[PDB]
TrEMBL record:
SS bond partners: 218-250
Top EC class for this record: hydrolase
Assigned EC number: 3.2.1.123
Protein name, entry field: Endoglycoceramidase II
UniProt entry keywords in alphabetical sequence: Glycosidase, Hydrolase
Length: 433
């Protein structure tokens, strides 16, 4: 597998949350999430990544007019993450196109929503709004399948350029996720993914690269079908940056059965199919890094822990980053509304390598042990950086295979140094006696 890298050339293993669904309908575009909430997250789970929801409607409230005060608010939040050593992926988020479809949808500004008078009647599940005539038309207009709105993708690309212009020099931002769960309307499958979807990604990448040459551009397949383990027809996106391509692949995982009986078997084979397809499309895109941009479930469902642990194990084997859906309060999230921890906290709170001085070829961890094998890179001078939870590591560390450079018992960051001229190096970290 391939990895995103920090400025020191270290390979990044990304672990965090989507923050947050509450942003979707917030008048000011911000999630109901405070700096104290982030402090709690970090203290409880030692996460190092966030998929932070932004919105086109907040970026471009009128055609060609960008809201710099909104971008100030996003920058403020990114600062909270920066102060705690997080890396940030900005997600241009939508579901069901726009709030203006009837609230139910979110994403596009009202001026960019053309339903052409076609109906959007109430449905028993939110996902079924996607196939209502007015919503299908709004998407068909956006992709210019109707031929009536070529301007919409151009506006979208330039809205992304405005965001990239603000964040190009932001050391905490590592990725731009160009579109949440792309939906093709009357176009579905390769006709959509290799057609207007890929075309929008190319135009948007090109626009972004006018102002930001180094942030990873992350592209998703269409969500319907592919979320459930079907193949993607997405095609390769060109990166005009000088030097190596910085495109990454950011699919989601939402097995149909969602964890017991035949449902468990179906979910397990879905993971297998999803893995094979994800690996294939990551190759098509140029042997690119993978970020599992969303997965999640009601943690109060029997079998939830086993599912979660299998997904993280799979991500680890694939060298994938993970942003769990989501940090929002409730049974899916790490905390219930009153602040009580769910199953997720103890499940996610395990040792992991955050930034590796070389390619991690394999690793494992339990509550009181981490082992990591590194393919060396002599060019990297920064140490390997590892998270160790206090539960299992209440005092000092015992490290075999590396020299301890620092052990910060407050931030929970262990830094170690390994030789680069002795082949692959295995580092094992356990609690001091
Ligand atoms: Na409109
Ligand atoms: Na950056």
């Amino acid at each position: 597998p391939s990895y995103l890298k920090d400025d020191d050339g270290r390979s990044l293993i990304l672990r965090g949350f989507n923050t947050a669904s509450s942003a979707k309908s917030a008048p000011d575009g911000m999630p109901q999430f405070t700096e104290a909430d982030l402090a709690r997250e970090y203290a409880d789970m030692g996460t190092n990544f966030v998929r932070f929801l932004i919105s086109w409607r907040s970026v471009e409230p009128a055609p060609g007019v960008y809201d710099q005060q909104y971008l100030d608010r996003v920058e403020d939040r990114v600062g909270w993450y920066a102060e705690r050593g997080y890396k940030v992926m900005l997600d241009m988020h939508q579901d069901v196109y726009s709030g203006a479809i009837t609230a139910i949808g979110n994403g596009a500004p009202a001026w960019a929503t053309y339903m052409d008078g076609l109906p959007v009647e109430p449905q028993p599940r939110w996902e079924l709004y996607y196939i209502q005539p007015g919503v299908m038309r709004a998407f068909d207009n956006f992709w210019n399948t109707t031929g009536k709105h070529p301007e919409l993708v151009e506006h979208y690309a330039k809205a992304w350029r405005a965001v990239a212009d603000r964040f190009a020099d932001n050391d905490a931002v590592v990725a731009y996720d160009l579109m949440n769960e792309p939906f093709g309307g009357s176009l579905q499958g390769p006709a959509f993914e290799a057609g207007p979807l890929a075309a929008m990604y190319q135009r948007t990448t090109d626009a972004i690269r006018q102002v930001d040459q180094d942030t990873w551009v992350c592209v998703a397949p269409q969500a319907i079908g592919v979320n459930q383990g079907l193949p993607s027809g997405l095609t390769k996106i060109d990166d005009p940056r000088a030097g190596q391509q910085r495109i990454a692949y950011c699919p989601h995982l939402y097995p149909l059965p969602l964890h017991e009986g035949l449902a468990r078997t179906l979910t397990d084979v879905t993971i297998d199919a999803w893995r094979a397809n994800t690996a294939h499309t990551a190759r098509v895109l140029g042997d690119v890094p993978i970020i599992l941009g969303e997965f999640g479930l009601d943690t109060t469902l029997p079998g939830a822990r086993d599912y979660i642990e299998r997904v993280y194990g799979t991500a680890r084997e694939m060298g994938a980053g993970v942003s769990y859906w989501s940090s929002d309060p409730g049974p899916w999230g790490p905390y219930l509304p009153d602040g009580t921890q769910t199953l997720l906290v103890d499940t996610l709170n395990k040792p992991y390598p955050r930034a590796v001085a070389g390619t991690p070829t394999e690793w494992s961890s339990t509550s009181d042990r981490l082992q990591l094998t590194i393919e060396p890179d002599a060019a990297i001078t920064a140490p390997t950086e590892i998270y160790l939870p206090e539960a299992g590591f209440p005092g000092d560390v015992h490290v075999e295979g590396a020299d301890v450079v620092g052990w910060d018992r407050q931030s929970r960051l262990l830094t170690v140094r390994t030789p680069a001229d002795s082949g692959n190096v295995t580092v094992t970290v356990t609690p001091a006696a």
